[PDB]
Design an enzyme around this catalytic site. Sequence first.
Site, PDB file in Angstrom:
ATOM      1  N   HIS A  85       0.823  -1.231   0.000  1.00 33.61           N
ATOM      2  CA  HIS A  85       0.000   0.000   0.000  1.00 33.61           C
ATOM      3  C   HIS A  85       0.853   1.276   0.000  1.00 33.61           C
ATOM      4  CE1 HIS A  85      -0.177   1.621   4.205  1.00 33.61           C
ATOM      5  NE2 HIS A  85       0.043   0.368   4.566  1.00 33.61           N
ATOM      6  N   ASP A 145       0.120  -7.563   1.922  1.00 37.85           N
ATOM      7  CA  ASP A 145       0.554  -6.151   1.867  1.00 37.85           C
ATOM      8  C   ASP A 145       2.078  -6.107   2.039  1.00 37.85           C
ATOM      9  OD1 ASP A 145       0.621  -3.403   1.796  1.00 37.85           O
ATOM     10  OD2 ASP A 145      -0.254  -3.139   3.798  1.00 37.85           O
ATOM     11  N   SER A 150       3.649   3.142   8.049  1.00 33.18           N
ATOM     12  CA  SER A 150       3.362   2.103   7.055  1.00 33.18           C
ATOM     13  C   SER A 150       4.579   1.698   6.257  1.00 33.18           C
ATOM     14  CB  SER A 150       2.288   2.576   6.092  1.00 33.18           C
ATOM     15  OG  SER A 150       1.080   2.776   6.799  1.00 33.18           O
ATOM     16  N   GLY A 151       4.710   0.390   6.055  1.00 29.62           N
ATOM     17  CA  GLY A 151       5.848  -0.173   5.354  1.00 29.62           C
ATOM     18  C   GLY A 151       7.078  -0.466   6.193  1.00 29.62           C
TER      19      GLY A 151
END
Length: 223
Positions: A40, A84, A177-178
């Site tokens: 994402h 993801d 995120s990530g």
Amino acid sequence: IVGGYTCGANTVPYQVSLNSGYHFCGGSLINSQWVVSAAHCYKSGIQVRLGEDNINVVEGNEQFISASKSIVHPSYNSNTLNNDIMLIKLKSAASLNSRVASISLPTSCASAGTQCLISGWGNTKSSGTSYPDVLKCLKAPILSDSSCKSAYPGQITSNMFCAGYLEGGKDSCQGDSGGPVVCSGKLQGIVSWGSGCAQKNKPGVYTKVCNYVSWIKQTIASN
Ligand SMILES: [Ca+2]
Ligand code: NA
């Protein structure tokens, strides 16, 4: 990171910032040419920033390397966030040292109750917005699959795990995120999703990296 602490410069040497004119996601360096992040976090133009502490000041240990290729997981579903995970290849190899270093991929999956290190430059508030300049850290335990599924009914796949605190107050958040979830020196998770940040009964949900090691190894060996 909500409810965490300032890590200390370069104490998390595998943490990267993904930049597209601005920090937008974290990632983890897994060897000199490859970063693992969340699908994402995909963007067309990505510069990988290694050796960062303050993302708004050049302090002297940074390496800035543009991506040559991104590879979103073949089965990534952006609706459910199943799978993801994305690999990013650097145009040139990073120079590995004390402040820039790779994190080991897991052989075993992580154990419930293990305290892991989650890190990033994401929002530090559960209500409102405040983005740090320096890297933030959080110690957070892996929750049981049963607790995770109870928190997010009908939403947790075999490729996801929960970590954090059901009472709220401590969590990763947007902008993290990530980035990494490291448990016993292995990259076990990727910051993926959650309902808000640090909310009661809504712990963080993380991509279960141990399910992807074969894909990661095969992909690196062919690209
Ligand atoms: Ca910097
Ligand atoms: Na292991």
